[PDB]
Scaffold this active site. Structure first.
Site, mmCIF file in Angstrom:
data_model
loop_
_atom_site.group_PDB
_atom_site.id
_atom_site.type_symbol
_atom_site.label_atom_id
_atom_site.label_comp_id
_atom_site.label_asym_id
_atom_site.label_seq_id
_atom_site.Cartn_x
_atom_site.Cartn_y
_atom_site.Cartn_z
ATOM 1 N N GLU A 38 0.821 -1.204 0.000
ATOM 2 C CA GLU A 38 0.000 0.000 0.000
ATOM 3 C C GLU A 38 0.859 1.261 0.000
ATOM 4 O OE1 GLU A 38 -3.250 -0.842 -0.207
ATOM 5 O OE2 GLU A 38 -3.651 1.220 -0.803
ATOM 6 N N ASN A 68 1.660 4.363 -3.213
ATOM 7 C CA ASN A 68 1.721 5.818 -3.105
ATOM 8 C C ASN A 68 3.089 6.363 -3.509
ATOM 9 O OD1 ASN A 68 -0.692 5.011 -1.557
ATOM 10 N ND2 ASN A 68 -0.820 7.183 -1.051
ATOM 11 N N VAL A 74 -7.357 10.023 7.062
ATOM 12 C CA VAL A 74 -8.726 10.035 6.527
ATOM 13 C C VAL A 74 -8.837 8.936 5.476
ATOM 14 C CG1 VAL A 74 -10.469 11.400 5.278
ATOM 15 C CG2 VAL A 74 -8.951 12.509 6.950
ATOM 16 N N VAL A 95 -6.805 0.645 -0.618
ATOM 17 C CA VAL A 95 -7.417 1.065 0.661
ATOM 18 C C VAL A 95 -6.847 2.373 1.240
ATOM 19 C CG1 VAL A 95 -8.157 -1.271 1.266
ATOM 20 C CG2 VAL A 95 -5.938 -0.429 2.131
ATOM 21 N N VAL A 141 -3.050 4.687 2.454
ATOM 22 C CA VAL A 141 -2.026 4.595 3.500
ATOM 23 C C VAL A 141 -2.553 4.933 4.894
ATOM 24 C CG1 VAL A 141 -0.088 4.995 1.954
ATOM 25 C CG2 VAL A 141 -1.162 6.953 3.153
ATOM 26 N N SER A 142 -3.741 5.528 4.979
ATOM 27 C CA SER A 142 -4.360 5.734 6.285
ATOM 28 C C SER A 142 -4.609 4.396 7.004
ATOM 29 C CB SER A 142 -5.642 6.548 6.160
ATOM 30 O OG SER A 142 -6.650 5.822 5.500
#
Ligand SMILES: Nc1nc2ccccc2[nH]1
Ligand SMILES: N#Cc1ccccc1O
Length: 185
Positions: free
Chosen positions: A27, A31, A82, A85, A87-88
């Site tokens: 994940e 990004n 927030v 899926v 990086v939160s």
């Protein structure tokens, strides 16, 4: 993030057989690849540290640091807190996460524990470089049985990503045994 904390497996994958644990890295890498694509040098470095944390560095523009007018906190903190899926999810499921952003001549740092910022994103210095770095320590409250990163699982996925994102350089480094790879198509 309490929805993630309530059922981690539904967001990250199985938290007992290693699936979710490794998905945490993928994940973040997703990004980092997007960031690297928008800059000149186009390189990411994934490091498995001796203490079982992973860091992902990119040489992109740095994620935005200015205050989000709606949320009232740094845009970087919005990305980290927030609800690919996001990086939160990784942040929510990490006992510690360190964010470093190099952008517009400044180094910015922030620490999270279990997704909770310990202080606001803060300027800590000057720099000529640009990029984003995240180091995270998976929560051993969440991830059981398989708690250590397997090099080969990471390498397999990063190799696949290097073909798809041709012209992005991906370096993998294991500080536990010195193993390393350089994926570049
Ligand atoms: N140990 C621990 N686990 C946590 C989960 C959510 C927020 C704070 C926490 N501290
Ligand atoms: N590492 C990394 C990263 C890059 C851009 C946005 C979020 C991240 O976790």
């Amino acid at each position: 993030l309490d929805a993630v904390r309530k059922r981690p497996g539904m967001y990250i994958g199985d938290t007992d057989d290693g699936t979710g644990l490794h998905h945490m890295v993928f994940e973040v890498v997703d990004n980092a690849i997007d960031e690297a694509l928008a800059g000149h040098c186009k390189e990411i470095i994934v490091t498995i540290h001796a203490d079982n944390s992973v860091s992902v560095q990119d040489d992109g523009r740095g994620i935005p640091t200015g205050i989000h007018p709606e949320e009232g906190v740094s845009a970087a903190e919005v990305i980290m807190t927030v609800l690919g899926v996001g990086v939160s999810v990784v942040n929510a499921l990490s006992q510690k996460l360190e964010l470093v952003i190099q952008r517009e001549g400044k180094i910015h740092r922030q620490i999270y524990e279990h997704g909770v910022p310990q202080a606001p994103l803060a300027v800590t210095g000057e720099t000529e470089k640009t990029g984003t770095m995240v180091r995270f320590w998976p929560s051993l409250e969440t991830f059981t049985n398989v708690t250590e990163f397997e090099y080969e699982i990471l390498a397999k996925r990063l190799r696949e990503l290097s073909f798809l994102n041709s012209g992005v350089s991906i370096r993998l480094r294991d500080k536990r045994d010195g193993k390393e790879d350089h994926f570049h198509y």
